[PDB]
């Protein structure tokens, strides 16, 4: 299932999390300077809820048990949100080895781990300053997937 | 971007050469201003309309890379710094090749470190249009001391001269080197030969042949064999042996290590690394040592005698190898008899009638077969006294040594050929040596027999005395035990003294008698000792007075203490 | 006499006090005091017996102003006065002692104590320390840097108390208000506890080879004074013990602990006794005791294969389906080297390690639960002698004496299989004539080096051979040694 | 120097021995134009003649209740508070910091938008409480929920006791969300005998939660021996889109999601917490049944 790789991609991230906060003493990872990137869409927010949590309507991995109309806005908004959190990934992957800096190193378990996701689902110095707050906000953010997966699938 | 609180720019450029001067400004968008400065992201530097545009002067910049924050306490920006040098001008290049079968690899000295990524080029060209290019990035975790380029060119035209080149960049400056002149005969180095086998020839240990199996056109080897008795290592060379050799003249039953190198050709190629040691065991070979033979002559009667046959062997040239069979065969020498029997040990007896002379042999048979059959005539035991030499002397000048000299018999030297010492274990000695130098198997502080026979076909004479190599003072001395008077004389009868207390030869006694109430010097009596004497006479005393007796025991190094007393009154 | 020393200070932000002593009787006498306002207003107060007089910024006092006071004591139909003040307020502020448990670290004649205090503004530091035997004594703990506070004493061999106090000096290396009083007191317990012999009991083994250890009860009396309680400083937290059966060691490291003073069941193995006592710094000191394997004189069936690549040794054990642990240690040697194996037979590779000729000790035991010293049973710890037998059973060195005319005394020197103990049997002694027509054996026993030959007839040359014989195959014959009289 | 409540005036004065006050004027909100007479609560008598007097405030002497009057009638009244600043530090004197150097100690019993907030007085004698959502800009989440400066247990600390005082609010949105972007900042003013305060602080409700230990635990034995909780009532529904993870201890530790575990005994009690199983926020306290 979609559930494993789930498990598995906040553990590498719990241990990524972790590790910056380790090494990256000084730097911007603490004060914590929560800014989304996420402005443009935010169906993420508005349409991963329960139906019974649902009271206004004006605001695969799917069991078959557990269909609905709108959970599907959900998913394609998780899954448009982690091809942007992938193409930035990317680039800040890219920027952090063209430098002789080579202090913290980022392994490839969230990439790897979202790639799968994607596949099962359908089908200077400013830059690591970048890397922790995007981190912080995806933090935030891998939480809020892990708990509709869990809701829908279950 | 992240510097929304401002931002931060450094003149003239991020990257910097050692010791040179920084301008720092910080700004911020319009509607205090302190400096971090960190060494490898560690502390151990620390620092509104003044604020808005900050210009600060910053030197002095230790080597590696360096933290500049600009921080109002919320951060504002901030730029990473590095410092660093141009790479050295590398020395000392040294390429090698391996075998037929193995591609370019060298080496070069990168010297100092200069904190930053740089990439290096190696470049060879050489004749016939041969030319390749390789490529290594440097940094603080990689080095790039050493590289293949993975290009094996044909070790067969070795006429083409050749040059290396090595080329450093990093961004502050390039850096090079000589193009370096090599000879393609220097760079290879074959690989040493492989099945390096034994095959076992002649069926002796002294001869052997080496197999193995290397290039075809190698034309010198050498080989090294060594055993364990001495560090220096048995060399020897060969000139097309074409992967071939045969061994002579090996000292045999011995452990032996053998290497091999290559050596493809003379004026050309290079030496070999050293190949698998082969620890390797020699086999036996059949002894032709001659074993003498000692016997015993004890009488139990005139039909029946006891006769003991007794031999040791004691050197690797008689005992070489697993020796585990000995045929005994005995001859009689007036009549036409033998006996055979096996043993296993060094002592064996048998029953033969006294009757007529003998010639004893034995063999020594080990892994291959037996050694030649050792055999030796035997005679009686002691002869005439014709024949019998001077009292041989004795003298032990060491510890742990004994020199027998022996005047020649009373008669002439000429008619025995070959002496026998024995005291038992046996030795040989020639009539022309004048003495006998024996220090084996010999402990002292014990009395000790020597005998010397010589060994006559007829009758052979018979010679022996007792003697120790060293004594000291007795520990003590016998007891007066019995006394007895008979015939106007004293008998006094003791029993053997145990041997430890002695702790050597003994020589003789010293009896004191006196009366009881006499304080001068008791009267003395001397008694030469002998083994086969245990009562001693002595002439009668005063009458009706009482007399006190005792002894003590004299050698020559020292004399025992005064033992029991003995009181009588005849 | 009557009111003297008067003095009013801030207790706290948002808080004010005022003290002073009385000198005469303390019958029918009340406490009046006064402060008046230059703009003039004057206020009063009063608390009769009591003298802690407790104000603040709300009842009226000026507190921004050179503020004066004055007192009356008033008894029977006299009134006296004392001396008239004048002062600000906020100054000469009494500070707060170190709140809560102040946290001390200890070193050779080294005792660290930080604490954190509120007010980060750094103050003087004094303090006062007493022996059960006299009084306190006084000591000023100099200037520190400051976020919290650290302070420093020479470390005294037995256990001490000490109160730790300051005051709020100025900026301009003054002394401002007074002393701050001594907090709770804190105390010391001794670096090093000199320790009593505790008693051990001792016991046979059983049959089943198993022994029962009760540790006695005891514990030393600290001499401490009479506020120190309530801390480890009287008397030592917890006493405690710990085993280490240090003879099957192919499991992971397997030490116990045991509070002191219960039922513990130990094997016939060695074994390491640590009592020790965790104070506030924890391990002080340690009493030692050796525990010193043994054996029971039951001896029980043992069967061995040894040779080739497969050393396989059997036996019948009581019970299959848990796992033994056996040990292969030669008994002579330093112990270099050593074998044990976790799997009645177990088989495994040889090695030269027992193959050569001196003592193996083989120790079998059964577990269930390698966590507990109770389930290890001694099994069986018997001695081995591995290769030939035969060479080592050889006499060495076989002297013959002659004592009478009939009777001649055999010595020779103990072999390597006397070293090994439960494995020689007898001696087979060979008296055979050179004739060959009279042959005797004697048998010796293993503990006897010496035998006397006997029925000896005279005159006629001997050969005399001695072996040493195992329970299992007889020894090789000696070199023969040829006497006679 | 604003209204705090009409017809209550607020000032800020320099508490520094050697700094003078600062000045304000008093006005009679009344259109008779005459000789009045004011007077104050702590000093006796009328200092200041005329409709418009200024006084220099110093001092608490200065703070309190001023009336105006004339004849036999009260023409007016007017309040003045004090803010009292020390050195460029604002000064809190009337709460105490929690153990964790935090004044203000909020909690959420789960995501249904209601938490309580709890502080530390030192004294009770004419308090008042008010609590606000400081809200600047218009999309910043908001409550409407009431005031209660409601006593409950008397907690202790490393000295002596102290009052607890505690509100329970409550957030009201519109429409609900996944996650929450704008941290929820709450206001609270203070004020002892005329010593006026303004505490403020901000948080997520999604860093402060404490959930509650379980409430139904059985015990079979199965050999082998589980034990059986389940999640409270008193939690956002349902258990699946937000679960709960638990600790176990007998009597440092392992932690277990399934309900049966089967460890087994050492003649000690067995309880377990109660945490989230995403963020490391506040354990609860353990209800349990040994063995
Ligand atoms: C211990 O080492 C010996 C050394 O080979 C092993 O073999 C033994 O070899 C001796 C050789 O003298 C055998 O003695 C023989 O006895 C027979 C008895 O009639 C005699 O006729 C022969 O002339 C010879 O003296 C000995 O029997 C033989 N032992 C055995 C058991 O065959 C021996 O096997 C080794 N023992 C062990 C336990 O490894
Ligand atoms: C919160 O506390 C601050 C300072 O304690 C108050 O700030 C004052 O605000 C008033 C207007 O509300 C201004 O006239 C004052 O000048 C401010 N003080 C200073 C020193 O400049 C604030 O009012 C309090 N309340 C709120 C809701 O923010
Ligand atoms: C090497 O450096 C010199 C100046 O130092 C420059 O002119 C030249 O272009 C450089 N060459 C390369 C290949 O970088
Ligand atoms: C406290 O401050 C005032 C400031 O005017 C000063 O006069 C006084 O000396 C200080 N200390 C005392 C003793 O009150
Ligand atoms: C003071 O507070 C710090 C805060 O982390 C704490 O670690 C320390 O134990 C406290 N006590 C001291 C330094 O005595």
């Given at each position: 299932?979609?559930?494993?790789?789930?498990?598995?991609?906040?553990?590498?991230?719990?241990?990524?999390?972790?590790?910056?906060?380790?090494?990256?003493?000084?730097?911007?990872?603490?004060?914590?300077?929560?800014?989304?990137?996420?402005?443009?869409?935010?169906?993420?927010?508005?349409?991963?809820?329960?139906?019974?949590?649902?009271?206004?309507?004006?605001?695969?991995?799917?069991?078959?048990?557990?269909?609905?109309?709108?959970?599907?806005?959900?998913?394609?908004?998780?899954?448009?949100?982690?091809?942007?959190?992938?193409?930035?990934?990317?680039?800040?992957?890219?920027?952090?080895?063209?430098?002789?800096?080579?202090?913290?190193?980022?392994?490839?378990?969230?990439?790897?781990?979202?790639?799968?996701?994607?596949?099962?689902?359908?089908?200077?110095?400013?830059?690591?300053?970048?890397?922790?707050?995007?981190?912080?906000?995806?933090?935030?953010?891998?939480?809020?997937?892990?708990?509709?997966?869990?809701?829908?699938?279950? | 971007?992240?510097?929304?609180?401002?931002?931060?720019?450094?003149?003239?450029?991020?990257?910097?050469?050692?010791?040179?001067?920084?301008?720092?400004?910080?700004?911020?968008?319009?509607?205090?201003?302190?400096?971090?400065?960190?060494?490898?992201?560690?502390?151990?530097?620390?620092?509104?309309?003044?604020?808005?545009?900050?210009?600060?002067?910053?030197?002095?910049?230790?080597?590696?890379?360096?933290?500049?924050?600009?921080?109002?306490?919320?951060?504002?920006?901030?730029?990473?710094?590095?410092?660093?040098?141009?790479?050295?001008?590398?020395?000392?290049?040294?390429?090698?090749?391996?075998?037929?079968?193995?591609?370019?690899?060298?080496?070069?000295?990168?010297?100092?470190?200069?904190?930053?990524?740089?990439?290096?080029?190696?470049?060879?060209?050489?004749?016939?249009?041969?030319?390749?290019?390789?490529?290594?990035?440097?940094?603080?975790?990689?080095?790039?001391?050493?590289?293949?380029?993975?290009?094996?060119?044909?070790?067969?035209?070795?006429?083409?001269?050749?040059?290396?080149?090595?080329?450093?960049?990093?961004?502050?400056?390039?850096?090079?080197?000589?193009?370096?002149?090599?000879?393609?005969?220097?760079?290879?180095?074959?690989?040493?030969?492989?099945?390096?086998?034994?095959?076992?020839?002649?069926?002796?240990?002294?001869?052997?042949?080496?197999?193995?199996?290397?290039?075809?056109?190698?034309?010198?080897?050498?080989?090294?064999?060594?055993?364990?008795?001495?560090?220096?290592?048995?060399?020897?060379?060969?000139?097309?042996?074409?992967?071939?050799?045969?061994?002579?003249?090996?000292?045999?039953?011995?452990?032996?290590?053998?290497?091999?190198?290559?050596?493809?050709?003379?004026?050309?190629?290079?030496?070999?690394?050293?190949?698998?040691?082969?620890?390797?065991?020699?086999?036996?070979?059949?002894?032709?040592?001659?074993?003498?033979?000692?016997?015993?002559?004890?009488?139990?009667?005139?039909?029946?005698?006891?006769?003991?046959?007794?031999?040791?062997?004691?050197?690797?040239?008689?005992?070489?190898?697993?020796?585990?069979?000995?045929?005994?065969?005995?001859?009689?020498?007036?009549?036409?008899?033998?006996?055979?029997?096996?043993?296993?040990?060094?002592?064996?007896?048998?029953?033969?009638?006294?009757?007529?002379?003998?010639?004893?042999?034995?063999?020594?048979?080990?892994?291959?077969?037996?050694?030649?059959?050792?055999?030796?005539?035997?005679?009686?035991?002691?002869?005439?006294?014709?024949?019998?030499?001077?009292?041989?002397?004795?003298?032990?000048?060491?510890?742990?040594?004994?020199?027998?000299?022996?005047?020649?018999?009373?008669?002439?030297?000429?008619?025995?050929?070959?002496?026998?010492?024995?005291?038992?274990?046996?030795?040989?000695?020639?009539?022309?040596?004048?003495?006998?130098?024996?220090?084996?198997?010999?402990?002292?502080?014990?009395?000790?027999?020597?005998?010397?026979?010589?060994?006559?076909?007829?009758?052979?004479?018979?010679?022996?005395?007792?003697?120790?190599?060293?004594?000291?003072?007795?520990?003590?001395?016998?007891?007066?035990?019995?006394?007895?008077?008979?015939?106007?004389?004293?008998?006094?009868?003791?029993?053997?003294?145990?041997?430890?207390?002695?702790?050597?030869?003994?020589?003789?006694?010293?009896?004191?008698?006196?009366?009881?109430?006499?304080?001068?010097?008791?009267?003395?009596?001397?008694?030469?000792?002998?083994?086969?004497?245990?009562?001693?006479?002595?002439?009668?005393?005063?009458?009706?007075?009482?007399?006190?007796?005792?002894?003590?025991?004299?050698?020559?190094?020292?004399?025992?203490?005064?033992?029991?007393?003995?009181?009588?009154?005849? | 006499?009557?009111?003297?020393?008067?003095?009013?200070?801030?207790?706290?932000?948002?808080?004010?006090?005022?003290?002073?002593?009385?000198?005469?009787?303390?019958?029918?006498?009340?406490?009046?005091?006064?402060?008046?306002?230059?703009?003039?207003?004057?206020?009063?107060?009063?608390?009769?017996?009591?003298?802690?007089?407790?104000?603040?910024?709300?009842?009226?006092?000026?507190?921004?102003?050179?503020?004066?006071?004055?007192?009356?004591?008033?008894?029977?139909?006299?009134?006296?006065?004392?001396?008239?003040?004048?002062?600000?307020?906020?100054?000469?502020?009494?500070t707060?002692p170190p709140?809560?448990?102040?946290?001390?670290?200890?070193?050779?004649?080294?005792?660290?104590?930080?604490?954190?205090?509120?007010?980060?503004?750094?103050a003087e530091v004094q303090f006062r320390r007493?022996?059960?035997?006299?009084?306190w004594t006084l000591g000023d703990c100099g200037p520190q840097?400051?976020?919290?506070e650290?302070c420093?004493?020479?470390?005294?061999?037995?256990?001490?108390?000490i109160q730790i106090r300051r005051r709020?000096r100025?900026?301009?290396?003054?002394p401002?208000?007074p002393w701050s009083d001594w907090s709770?007191?804190?105390?010391?317990?001794?670096?090093?506890?000199?320790?009593?012999?505790?008693?051990?009991?001792?016991?046979?083994?059983?049959?089943?080879?198993?022994?029962?250890?009760?540790?006695?009860?005891?514990?030393?009396?600290?001499?401490?004074?009479?506020?120190?309680?309530?801390?480890?400083?009287?008397?030592?937290?917890?006493?405690?013990?710990?085993?280490?059966?240090?003879?099957?060691?192919?499991?992971?490291?397997?030490?116990?602990?045991?509070?002191?003073?219960?039922?513990?069941?130990?094997?016939?193995?060695?074994?390491?006794?640590?009592?020790?006592?965790?104070?506030?710094?924890?391990?002080?000191?340690?009493?030692?005791?050796?525990?010193?394997?043994?054996?029971?004189?039951?001896?029980?069936?043992?069967?061995?294969?040894?040779?080739?690549?497969?050393?396989?040794?059997?036996?019948?054990?009581?019970?299959?389906?848990?796992?033994?642990?056996?040990?292969?240690?030669?008994?002579?040697?330093?112990?270099?080297?050593?074998?044990?194996?976790?799997?009645?037979?177990?088989?495994?590779?040889?090695?030269?390690?027992?193959?050569?000729?001196?003592?193996?000790?083989?120790?079998?035991?059964?577990?269930?639960?390698?966590?507990?010293?109770?389930?290890?049973?001694?099994?069986?710890?018997?001695?081995?002698?591995?290769?030939?037998?035969?060479?080592?059973?050889?006499?060495?060195?076989?002297?013959?004496?002659?004592?009478?005319?009939?009777?001649?005394?055999?010595?020779?020197?103990?072999?390597?299989?006397?070293?090994?103990?439960?494995?020689?049997?007898?001696?087979?002694?060979?008296?055979?004539?050179?004739?060959?027509?009279?042959?005797?054996?004697?048998?010796?026993?293993?503990?006897?080096?010496?035998?006397?030959?006997?029925?000896?007839?005279?005159?006629?040359?001997?050969?005399?051979?001695?072996?040493?014989?195992?329970?299992?195959?007889?020894?090789?014959?000696?070199?023969?040694?040829?006497?006679?009289? | 120097?604003?209204?705090?409540?009409?017809?209550?005036?607020?000032?800020?004065?320099?508490?520094?021995?050697?700094?003078?006050?600062?000045?304000?004027?008093?006005?009679?909100?009344?259109?008779?134009?005459?000789?009045?007479?004011?007077?104050?609560?702590?000093?006796?008598?009328?200092?200041?003649?005329?409709?418009?007097?200024?006084?220099?405030?110093?001092?608490?002497?200065?703070?309190?209740?001023?009336?105006?009057?004339?004849?036999?009638?009260?023409?007016?009244?007017?309040?003045?508070?004090?803010?009292?600043?020390?050195?460029?530090?604002?000064?809190?004197?009337?709460?105490?910091?929690?153990?964790?150097?935090?004044?203000?100690?909020?909690?959420?019993?789960?995501?249904?938008?209601?938490?309580?907030?709890?502080?530390?007085?030192?004294?009770?004698?004419?308090?008042?409480?008010?609590?606000?959502?400081?809200?600047?800009?218009?999309?910043?989440?908001?409550?409407?929920?009431?005031?209660?400066?409601?006593?409950?247990?008397?907690?202790?600390?490393?000295?002596?006791?102290?009052?607890?005082?505690?509100?329970?609010?409550?957030?009201?949105?519109?429409?609900?969300?996944?996650?929450?972007?704008?941290?929820?900042?709450?206001?609270?003013?203070?004020?002892?005998?005329?010593?006026?305060?303004?505490?403020?602080?901000?948080?997520?409700?999604?860093?402060?939660?404490?959930?509650?230990?379980?409430?139904?635990?059985?015990?079979?034995?199965?050999?082998?021996?589980?034990?059986?909780?389940?999640?409270?009532?008193?939690?956002?529904?349902?258990?699946?889109?937000?679960?709960?993870?638990?600790?176990?201890?007998?009597?440092?530790?392992?932690?277990?999601?399934?309900?049966?575990?089967?460890?087994?005994?050492?003649?000690?009690?067995?309880?377990?917490?109660?945490?989230?199983?995403?963020?490391?926020?506040?354990?609860?306290?353990?209800?349990?049944?040994?063995?």
């Open positions: 299932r979609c559930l494993s790789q789930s498990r598995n991609l906040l553990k590498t991230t719990d241990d990524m999390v972790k590790t910056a906060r380790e090494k990256l003493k000084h730097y911007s990872c603490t004060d914590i300077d929560h800014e989304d990137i996420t402005r443009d869409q935010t169906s993420t927010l508005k349409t991963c809820l329960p139906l019974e949590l649902h009271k206004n309507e004006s605001c695969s991995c799917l069991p078959p048990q557990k269909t609905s109309l709108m959970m599907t806005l959900c998913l394609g908004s998780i899954y448009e949100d982690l091809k942007m959190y992938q193409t930035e990934f990317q680039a800040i992957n890219a920027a952090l080895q063209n430098h002789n800096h080579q202090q913290i190193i980022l392994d490839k378990g969230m990439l790897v781990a979202i790639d799968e996701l994607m596949q099962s689902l359908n089908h200077p110095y400013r830059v690591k300053m970048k890397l922790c707050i995007l981190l912080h906000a995806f933090s935030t953010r891998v939480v809020t997937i892990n708990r509709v997966m869990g809701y829908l699938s279950s | 971007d992240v510097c929304k609180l401002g931002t931060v720019t450094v003149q003239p450029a991020p990257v910097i050469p050692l010791g040179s001067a920084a301008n720092i400004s910080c700004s911020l968008n319009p509607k205090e201003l302190i400096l971090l400065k960190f060494v490898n992201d560690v502390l151990v530097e620390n620092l509104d309309h003044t604020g808005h545009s900050s210009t600060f002067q910053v030197t002095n910049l230790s080597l590696g890379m360096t933290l500049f924050v600009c921080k109002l306490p919320v951060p504002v920006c901030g730029v990473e710094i590095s410092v660093g040098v141009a790479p050295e001008p590398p020395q000392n290049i040294s390429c090698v090749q391996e075998g037929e079968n193995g591609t370019v690899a060298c080496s070069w000295n990168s010297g100092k470190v200069t904190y930053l990524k740089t990439n290096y080029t190696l470049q060879l060209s050489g004749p016939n249009n041969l030319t390749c290019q390789k490529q290594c990035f440097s940094d603080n975790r990689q080095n790039c001391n050493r590289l293949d380029l993975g290009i094996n060119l044909s070790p067969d035209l070795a006429e083409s001269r050749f040059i290396v080149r090595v080329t450093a960049i990093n961004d502050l400056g390039n850096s090079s080197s000589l193009p370096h002149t090599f000879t393609f005969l220097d760079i290879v180095i074959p690989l040493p030969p492989w099945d390096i086998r034994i095959n076992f020839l002649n069926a002796s240990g002294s001869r052997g042949t080496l197999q193995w199996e290397d290039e075809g056109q190698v034309v010198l080897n050498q080989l090294r064999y060594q055993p364990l008795n001495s560090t220096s290592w048995n060399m020897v060379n060969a000139t097309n042996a074409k992967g071939k050799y045969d061994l002579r003249d090996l000292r045999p039953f011995t452990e032996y290590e053998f290497q091999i190198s290559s050596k493809l050709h003379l004026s050309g190629g290079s030496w070999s690394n050293w190949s698998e040691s082969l620890r390797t065991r020699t086999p036996e070979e059949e002894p032709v040592g001659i074993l003498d033979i000692w016997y015993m002559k004890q009488d139990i009667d005139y039909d029946r005698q006891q006769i003991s046959l007794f031999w040791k062997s004691l050197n690797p040239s008689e005992a070489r190898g697993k020796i585990l069979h000995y045929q005994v065969t005995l001859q009689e020498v007036t009549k036409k008899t033998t006996l055979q029997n096996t043993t296993r040990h060094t002592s064996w007896t048998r029953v033969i009638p006294r009757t007529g002379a003998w010639t004893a042999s034995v063999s020594a048979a080990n892994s291959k077969g037996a050694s030649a059959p050792t055999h030796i005539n035997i005679v009686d035991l002691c002869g005439t006294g014709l024949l019998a030499p001077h009292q041989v002397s004795a003298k032990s000048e060491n510890m742990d040594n004994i020199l027998v000299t022996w005047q020649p018999p009373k008669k002439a030297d000429s008619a025995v050929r070959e002496y026998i010492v024995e005291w038992p274990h046996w030795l040989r000695i020639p009539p022309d040596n004048m003495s006998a130098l024996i220090s084996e198997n010999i402990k002292p502080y014990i009395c000790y027999e020597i005998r010397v026979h010589a060994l006559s076909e007829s009758q052979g004479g018979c010679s022996s005395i007792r003697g120790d190599s060293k004594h000291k003072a007795p520990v003590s001395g016998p007891h007066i035990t019995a006394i007895t008077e008979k015939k106007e004389r004293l008998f006094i009868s003791w029993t053997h003294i145990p041997f430890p207390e002695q702790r050597g030869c003994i020589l003789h006694y010293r009896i004191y008698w006196k009366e009881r109430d006499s304080t001068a010097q008791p009267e003395l009596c001397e008694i030469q000792y002998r083994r086969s004497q245990n009562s001693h006479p002595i002439s009668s005393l005063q009458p009706r007075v009482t007399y006190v007796l005792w002894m003590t025991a004299v050698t020559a190094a020292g004399e025992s203490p005064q033992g029991n007393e003995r009181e009588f009154c005849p | 006499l009557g009111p003297r020393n008067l003095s009013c200070y801030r207790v706290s932000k948002t808080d004010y006090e005022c003290s002073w002593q009385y000198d005469g009787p303390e019958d029918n006498v009340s406490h009046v005091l006064w402060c008046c306002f230059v703009p003039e207003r004057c206020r009063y107060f009063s608390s009769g017996p009591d003298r802690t007089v407790q104000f603040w910024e709300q009842d009226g006092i000026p507190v921004l102003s050179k503020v004066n006071f004055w007192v009356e004591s008033r008894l029977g139909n006299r009134t006296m006065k004392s001396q008239k003040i004048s002062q600000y307020l906020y100054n000469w502020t009494k707060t709140l809560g448990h102040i946290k001390v670290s200890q070193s050779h004649r080294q005792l660290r104590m930080d604490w954190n205090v509120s007010e980060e503004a750094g007493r022996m059960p035997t006299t009084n840097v400051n976020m919290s650290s420093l004493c020479p470390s005294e061999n037995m256990a001490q108390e709020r100025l900026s301009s290396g003054a401002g208000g709770m007191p804190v105390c010391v317990p001794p670096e090093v506890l000199p320790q009593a012999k505790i008693k051990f009991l001792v016991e046979p083994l059983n049959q089943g080879g198993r022994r029962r250890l009760t540790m006695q009860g005891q514990s030393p009396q600290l001499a401490v004074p009479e506020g120190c309680r309530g801390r480890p400083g009287a008397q030592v937290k917890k006493h405690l013990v710990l085993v280490r059966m240090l003879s099957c060691r192919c499991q992971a490291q397997t030490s116990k602990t045991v509070p002191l003073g219960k039922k513990l069941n130990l094997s016939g193995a060695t074994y390491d006794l640590n009592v020790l006592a965790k104070t506030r710094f924890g391990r002080s000191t340690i009493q030692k005791w050796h525990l010193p394997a043994q054996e029971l004189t039951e001896t029980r069936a043992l069967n061995v294969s040894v040779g080739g690549n497969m050393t396989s040794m059997q036996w019948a054990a009581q019970a299959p389906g848990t796992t033994y642990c056996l040990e292969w240690q030669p008994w002579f040697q330093h112990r270099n080297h050593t074998h044990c194996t976790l799997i009645v037979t177990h088989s495994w590779s040889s090695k030269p390690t027992l193959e050569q000729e001196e003592c193996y000790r083989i120790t079998v035991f059964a577990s269930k639960n390698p966590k507990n010293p109770m389930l290890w049973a001694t099994v069986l710890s018997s001695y081995y002698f591995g290769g030939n037998a035969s060479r080592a059973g050889t006499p060495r060195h076989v002297s013959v004496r002659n004592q009478t005319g009939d009777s001649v005394s055999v010595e020779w020197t103990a072999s390597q299989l006397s070293t090994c103990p439960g494995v020689l049997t007898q001696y087979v002694v060979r008296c055979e004539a050179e004739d060959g027509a009279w042959e005797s054996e004697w048998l010796v026993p293993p503990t006897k080096t010496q035998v006397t030959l006997d029925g000896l007839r005279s005159r006629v040359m001997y050969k005399v051979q001695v072996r040493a014989d195992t329970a299992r195959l007889p020894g090789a014959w000696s070199h023969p040694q040829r006497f006679s009289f | 120097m604003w209204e705090l409540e009409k017809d209550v005036y607020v000032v800020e004065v320099d508490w520094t021995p050697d700094a003078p006050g600062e000045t304000v004027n008093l006005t009679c909100d009344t259109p008779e134009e005459d000789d009045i007479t004011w007077t104050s609560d702590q000093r006796h008598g009328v200092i200041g003649s005329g409709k418009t007097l200024t006084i220099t405030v110093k001092e608490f002497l200065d703070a309190g209740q001023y009336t105006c009057h004339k004849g036999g009638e009260t023409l007016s009244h007017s309040h003045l508070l004090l803010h009292k600043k020390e050195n460029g530090i604002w000064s809190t004197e009337i709460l105490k910091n929690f153990k964790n150097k935090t004044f203000l100690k909020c909690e959420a019993p789960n995501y249904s938008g209601r938490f309580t907030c709890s502080w530390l007085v030192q004294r009770n004698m004419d308090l008042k409480f008010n609590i606000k959502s400081s809200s600047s800009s218009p999309d910043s989440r908001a409550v409407t929920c009431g005031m209660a400066s409601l006593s409950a247990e008397k907690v202790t600390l490393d000295q002596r006791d102290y009052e607890k005082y505690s509100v329970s609010c409550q957030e009201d949105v519109t429409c609900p969300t996944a996650e929450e972007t704008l941290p929820i900042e709450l206001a609270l003013e203070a004020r002892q005998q005329n010593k006026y305060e303004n505490y403020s602080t901000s948080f997520f409700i999604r860093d402060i939660i404490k959930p509650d230990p379980p409430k139904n635990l059985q015990m079979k034995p199965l050999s082998q021996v589980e034990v059986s909780w389940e999640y409270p009532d008193s939690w956002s529904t349902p258990h699946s889109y937000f679960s709960l993870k638990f600790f176990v201890r007998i009597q440092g530790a392992f932690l277990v999601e399934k309900t049966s575990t089967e460890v087994q005994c050492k003649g000690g009690n067995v309880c377990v917490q109660a945490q989230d199983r995403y963020y490391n926020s506040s354990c609860s306290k353990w209800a349990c049944v040994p063995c």
